[PDB]
Design a protein around this nucleic acid. Structure first.
Ligand SMILES: [Mg+2]
Ligand SMILES: [Mg+2]
Ligand SMILES: [Mg+2]
Ligand SMILES: [Mg+2]
Ligand SMILES: [Mg+2]
Ligand SMILES: [Mg+2]
Ligand SMILES: [Mg+2]
Ligand SMILES: [Mg+2]
Ligand SMILES: [Mg+2]
Ligand SMILES: [Mg+2]
Ligand SMILES: [Mg+2]
Ligand SMILES: [Mg+2]
Ligand SMILES: [Mg+2]
Ligand SMILES: [Mg+2]
Ligand SMILES: [Mg+2]
Ligand SMILES: [Mg+2]
Ligand SMILES: [Mg+2]
Ligand SMILES: [Mg+2]
Ligand SMILES: [Mg+2]
Ligand SMILES: [Mg+2]
Ligand SMILES: [Mg+2]
Ligand SMILES: [Mg+2]
Ligand SMILES: [Mg+2]
Ligand SMILES: [Mg+2]
Ligand SMILES: [Mg+2]
Ligand SMILES: [Mg+2]
Lengths: 187, 144, 258, 123
RNA sequence: UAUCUGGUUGAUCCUGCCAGUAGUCAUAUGCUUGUCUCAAAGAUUAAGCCAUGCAUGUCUAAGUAUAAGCAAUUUAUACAGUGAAACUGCGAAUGGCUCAUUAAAUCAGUUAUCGUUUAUUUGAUAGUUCCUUUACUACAUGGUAUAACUGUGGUAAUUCUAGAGCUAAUACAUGCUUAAAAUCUCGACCCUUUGGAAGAGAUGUAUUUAUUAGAUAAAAAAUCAAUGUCUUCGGACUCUUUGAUGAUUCAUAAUAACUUUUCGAAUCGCAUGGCCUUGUGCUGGCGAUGGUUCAUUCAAAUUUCUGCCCUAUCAACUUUCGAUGGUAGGAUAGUGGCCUACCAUGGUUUCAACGGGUAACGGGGAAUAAGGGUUCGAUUCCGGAGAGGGAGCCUGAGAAACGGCUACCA
RNA sequence: GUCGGAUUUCCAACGGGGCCUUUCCUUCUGGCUAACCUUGAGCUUGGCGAACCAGGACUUUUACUUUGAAAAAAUUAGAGUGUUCAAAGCAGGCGUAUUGCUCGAAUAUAUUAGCAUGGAAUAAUAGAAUAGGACG
RNA sequence: ACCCACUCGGCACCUUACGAGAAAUCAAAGUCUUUGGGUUCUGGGGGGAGUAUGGUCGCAAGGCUGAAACUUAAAGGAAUUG
RNA sequence: GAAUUUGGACAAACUUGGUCAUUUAGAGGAACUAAAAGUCGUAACAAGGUUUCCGUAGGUGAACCUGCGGAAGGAUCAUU
RNA sequence: UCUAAGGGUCGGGUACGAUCAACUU
RNA sequence: CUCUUAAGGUAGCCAAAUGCCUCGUCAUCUAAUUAGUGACGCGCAUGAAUGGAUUAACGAGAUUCCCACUGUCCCUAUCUA
């Protein structure tokens, strides 16, 4: 099937290499998963040396790390919003590595209030003493406060769903965030 | 070089696993990662204070120089981040007791930290397959 | 192709086993074990062709199934178990103890050792790095791993292993002026009191070496085995002490007695 | 598959077929050594030649070369040991001029004649 | 063993070829053939086609036996003796054979994996899994189905098999059982300033993502943000923990989580011993099998530099639809235009690219040789490739397997 | 100078090494401080680091040639040895052969390419000329 | 403009053979078995044949590049005597 | 959890063209080699009875002849 | 039903932004 | 060799739109060809600005064969104005 050898396509000089060495299994490929959103369905793949590989399809949720706070949570995905490789993946809402997505941002909002408690968007003394200590850090950035109002966060998939069956990533911040927002809003 | 107006590609260009945190403020706003390639090759000043990415750079990328170290004269630099160098040698034909000129073209990836021209004598270090035909990486420029 | 090979033709086996070219197409292919196939004794060669203790492979097979032969104090019933450099072969019958040490000629020479000597062995340390849970370990040349080693142990040293527990009693640091034993190379089987070494970053570090008769030779770093501080070694050297007598004058020694 | 068996021919034929000079001489050699054919002489010529090819090799090498001294004494040891070369001639230059028949002299059937008991070589 | 000779004219000296001469692990064939040792052998044409018969099976003390098998142990009423069949576990990826293809391809020498997979061998290696984790609960151990077998049948036939009835596990599927200690999160109160608390949870390994450490040429002072262990709150201040490589985002460790959840022994032989509150009470040896991970070994995949025969009546080739490179991703055990999307216009060649031929598998080597060479290498070892031609794929650590399967063509 | 085998003080040759003749033919943090002006009564307390080491900025590039390491085994050359000789093969040989002893299975060749080391003649490259030249 | 002596370059010439060559002959056709100053082109027994075909150039004539089948033991060079 | 099925890539094979390479038929035309005492001439070798040959062009049964330019391998190394 | 590309006009002390509208692929 | 002209048809070309004999002879295309084409040449009676031999392109020019297509035909039938 899909083979990764190079005794096919032409040599450097442009010459064509003649046939040799009928296809080998250790030089194979397979076909893309094209993992979509919703109705979780993961299929297993028997790879070389056993080494089971999980092929994601129709996945639901993921583990996304808000880098600044050194935390991660389980949140959903709204859809693909920007894909550097092929714009076709965006329209079909296809999940790949480094495909910008919008996530649910719900657990993050309550975690922020649980951890900082000052405010986001818009009882016992054991709590605010932490808050008093965990002060001077509720000024994260003005470009993520506005995202919290709508309850969707621009996230990037840093995992390979086709290989590990999981969609993990991080929330865009700082320079990276300003790089995609200008690409998104241009008209 | 001309700094290639770094943020030009569709995907954001960054050094992997090099995180800058916006909560705190200090000097060196964008952290830069680099390494010394060893074998006495020095890390050029441009790589330290540049802005390029070139994840194949032997000083600021994910590639490592190991194996043969070669030398040749740059003969074509019309690629992007790649040059072709010519390595001449005399092949000894045993019957006639004398030598004959020969040459080869070794396409080598050139880091943005270097500036090269046709005629520059450059040394390259072996590394893992970078592209279909690139297996060496420009590591020291000896002429201008 | 399609998987590993399982036979070994004669004319392919390592030449230091001294196997005659005729008398059979195939040779004993060493199984996986503590030592490289290329430098390996295996017992069907040791017991039958060196000691003459058995006339066929089937008698060699019979001896092993009596749990008599034991390498490093463990039974090792297998007939093609690869016996390597400086393993100790102990036989209950005749109370005979053997050590595998290369002769001056680069062959595994029969070498009987005292019973006290069979109570330990040396292994050259190949790599020393942290394992899981931050537990440092070493790797000797025979694949033996030893957790919690002395931090001062570095690569290319040698260690004295109890051979009853996997523990180390002593280690000899790698320094110029230490007695060594060349394993592998054209100078195989020589002992030479290191003079110095070169760095040569980029691999294949060389070392210069000179025997008692003031003959200098050089071999690669991987082909050197320190066997203790100058003078006395920590193992019983075989007869000859690896001097590499030239063909010119050895015959006179050979003709000395006749 | 078994190790091939080395073999080698023990004789070489002369280049020119019909020399009146060579035909007479070899026939004389069989006359007083009782050899059946010309092959028993060609072999001695071949044996002598590979002796000289080695003998010539050592001489052109430098004197006191460890190769010549060791091997050169090896060759004259064997030639003397058989009796082909006289003891007084051990210079490795007197091997180069040995003779055709000195080997034929040390043949058993010749030596038996010399040690009586046959009263004719064909006996 | 650095050797030449016959043939152009009436005669001569040259150029020059024809003939002779010698050898051939170079074949065939003719005539002849007494002995000993040794030994090639349907390669050359047809990698043409094949009757028949063989060439891959396998058990110990140590997985499973109610044979409605065989004899007697008699130590045994459950078994422990031998032991067909069958399940299970391994192997069938080795070997053997051929040389069709193949001309920077294979291959030889030499590098790399800081670029990956590795059954097996050898050496090390899980006190953390009663999940509302105080009755959910078997842990002196928990379920299901089936073969063999009994019986009924079909077909002309195949190493074909249906329905019915039983029965096992190292088959399959579940499943608890052991110390602490410390740490970090939460968090009842005194109530307060210097603030500590009861109590709870988590804290193995494995997968995925993110973030932190993974230093280390030299010596002294300034006051601050606030003491910072203990204070004679003057500050003595040190211990401040840190491996390897030329080199790393390395080894390894820490925090946050994630998993549709891996592993963390419901297995077998032999000898049976010590402790008592002698109860089938508590402990106890030598092994076998399996098992996560790391390392080694047997490998494999890819890879560097250089090296190949005849051809110009082959001078340009490559990029339509991958050609050369960049970025991103998908795929792979992994690098890589391997593939896809976007972008650039590159890449080889008179130092012979590309195209053509090869009565071309490459080498180690073979014959002949003064030195130099010429010619051969299907064939005893190493390497590759193939199983009438093509293509795809299951099982497995390992196959694009063919004494495996599927399809097409013959 | 022992009865054909080696020593010395030797007249020579052959080839190496060190110093000087304007002849640095790179070096710092520290160790041996080393060869120590170190001397203590004729064997004593203290000289200048590579003669050995970790890191130093630098570091003119080649070709050549010497040595060395790798270049499977078989085959080739070749040491030894009774296969009765030999083609071969890697055996065997010596004992009072009652208990045993013991030598071997060498060595070399292995184009070219790659790696390390010494020479620096021969054959090429570059350097300080509208001096950012070197020392400072 | 002549004469004498000398010199640099050229077109040549006369005698000699130390040397070269198969020889006719050569001051280069020498310094080549005592075989190496640098370099380009061409040749490999006689015929078929400078033919066929294919390119390419030309208005054409024709040029350049250029085989194979086949057939043969001599073609040839320089001198000697007739 | 079987039959069946949507779409995808790998993709054998067939049909129809195209191209290239190798063998091969063919009326007829035109060469070349050989034998045979064929027919016509006598162009070459002697100043070969018009000196021979080269390039080019034209012509004629055929060897060849003729022009123009050359060469000596000429039948002259030579006229102060 | 979408996507990419192809423009005009205004704007810095002595690279970008705003507005408008084309059918071609 | 002969008779004879002002000179005896050259290079080319041909059963040609020029060939009587003729449906010439050989080959090809065909199941079968007075047709077509390629060859042949004693050509009733070709042939050189009466222009000769070829010729890419062009043609409501003349002719032959092949593929596609078809009620031209086998073999007719139906419908509309
Ligand atoms: Mg084995
Ligand atoms: Mg003649
Ligand atoms: Mg004649
Ligand atoms: Mg005659
Ligand atoms: Mg001949
Ligand atoms: Mg095989
Ligand atoms: Mg194990
Ligand atoms: Mg790319
Ligand atoms: Mg990539
Ligand atoms: Mg072939
Ligand atoms: Mg063949
Ligand atoms: Mg083979
Ligand atoms: Mg195969
Ligand atoms: Mg067949
Ligand atoms: Mg197959
Ligand atoms: Mg078969
Ligand atoms: Mg070199
Ligand atoms: Mg030169
Ligand atoms: Mg003049
Ligand atoms: Mg010739
Ligand atoms: Mg010729
Ligand atoms: Mg003549
Ligand atoms: Mg005539
Ligand atoms: Mg006449
Ligand atoms: Mg004439
Ligand atoms: Mg002539």
């Amino acid at each position: 099937g899909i083979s990764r050898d190079s005794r096919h396509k032409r040599s450097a000089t442009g010459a064509k290499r003649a046939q040799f060495r009928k296809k080998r299994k250790f030089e194979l490929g397979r076909q893309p998963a094209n993992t979509k959103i919703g109705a979780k369905r993961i299929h297993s793949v028997r790879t070389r040396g056993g080494n089971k590989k999980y092929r994601a399809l129709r996945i639901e949720t993921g583990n996304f790390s808000w880098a600044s706070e050194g935390i991660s949570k389980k949140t959903r995905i709204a859809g693909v919003v920007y894909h550097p490789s092929n714009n076709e993946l965006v329209r079909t809402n296809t999940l790949t590595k480094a495909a910008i997505v919008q996530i649910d941002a719900t657990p993050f909002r309550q975690w922020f209030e649980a951890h900082y408690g000052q405010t986001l968007g818009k009882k016992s003394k054991n709590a605010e003493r932490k808050w008093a200590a965990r002060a001077a850090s509720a000024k994260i950035e003005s470009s993520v406060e506005s995202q919290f109002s709508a309850g969707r966060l621009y996230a990037c998939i840093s995992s390979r769903p086709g290989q590990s069956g999981r969609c993990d990533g991080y929330i865009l911040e700082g320079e990276e965030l300003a790089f995609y927002l200008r690409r998104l809003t241009a008209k | 070089s001309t700094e290639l107006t770094v943020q030009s590609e569709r995907a954001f260009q960054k050094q992997p696993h090099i995180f800058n945190n916006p909560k705190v403020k200090t000097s060196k706003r964008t952290k830069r990662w680099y390494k010394n390639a060893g074998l006495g090759f020095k890390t050029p000043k441009t790589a330290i204070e540049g802005s390029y990415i070139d994840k194949k750079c032997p000083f600021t990328g994910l590639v490592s120089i190991r194996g043969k170290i070669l030398t040749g004269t740059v003969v074509s630099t019309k690629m992007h981040r790649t040059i072709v160098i010519r390595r001449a040698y005399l092949h000894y034909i045993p019957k006639y007791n004398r030598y004959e000129k020969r040459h080869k073209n070794v396409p080598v990836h050139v880091s943005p930290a270097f500036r090269v021209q046709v005629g520059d004598i450059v040394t390259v270090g072996q590394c893992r397959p970078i592209s279909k035909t690139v297996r060496f990486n420009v590591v020291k420029v000896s002429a201008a | 192709a399609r998987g590993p090979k399982k036979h070994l033709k004669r004319l392919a086996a390592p030449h230091h086993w001294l196997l005659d070219k005729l008398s059979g197409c195939y040779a004993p292919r060493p199984s996986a074990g503590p030592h490289k196939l290329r430098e390996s004794l295996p017992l069907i060669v040791f017991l039958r062709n060196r000691l003459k203790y058995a006339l066929n492979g089937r008698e060699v097979k019979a001896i092993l199934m009596q749990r008599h032969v034991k390498v490093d104090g463990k039974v090792r019933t297998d007939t093609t178990y690869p016996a390597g450099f400086m393993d100790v072969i102990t036989l209950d019958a005749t109370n005979e103890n053997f050590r595998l040490v290369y002769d001056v000629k680069g062959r595994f020479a029969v070498h009987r050792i005292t019973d006290e000597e069979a109570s330990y062995k040396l292994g050259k340390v190949k790599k020393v790095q942290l394992g899981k849970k931050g537990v440092p370990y070493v790797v000797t040349h025979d694949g033996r791993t030893i957790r919690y080693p002395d931090p001062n142990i570095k690569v290319n040293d040698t260690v004295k292993i109890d051979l009853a527990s996997g523990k180390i009693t002593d280690f000899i640091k790698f320094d110029a002026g230490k007695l060594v034993y060349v394993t592998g190379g054209r100078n195989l089987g020589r002992i030479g009191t290191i003079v110095h070494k070169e760095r040569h970053d980029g691999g294949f570090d060389l070392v210069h070496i000179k025997d008692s008769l003031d003959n200098t030779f050089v071999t690669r770093l991987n082909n050197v085995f320190v066997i203790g501080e100058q003078g006395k070694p920590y193992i019983s050297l075989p007869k000859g002490k690896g001097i590499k007598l030239s063909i010119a004058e050895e015959r006179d020694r050979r003709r000395a007695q006749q | 598959p078994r190790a091939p068996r080395t073999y080698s021919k023990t004789y070489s034929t002369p280049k020119r077929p019909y020399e009146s000079s060579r035909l007479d001489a070899e026939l004389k050699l069989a006359g007083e050594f009782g050899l059946k054919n010309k092959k028993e002489i060609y072999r001695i010529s071949f044996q002598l030649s590979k002796i000289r090819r080695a003998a010539r090799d050592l001489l052109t090498r430098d004197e006191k070369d460890p190769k010549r001294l060791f091997e050169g004494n090896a060759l004259i040891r064997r030639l003397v040991r058989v009796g082909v070369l006289s003891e007084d001639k051990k210079k490795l230059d007197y091997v180069l001029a040995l003779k055709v028949e000195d080997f034929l002299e040390r043949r058993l059937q010749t030596q038996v004649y010399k040690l009586g008991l046959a009263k004719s070589v064909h006996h």
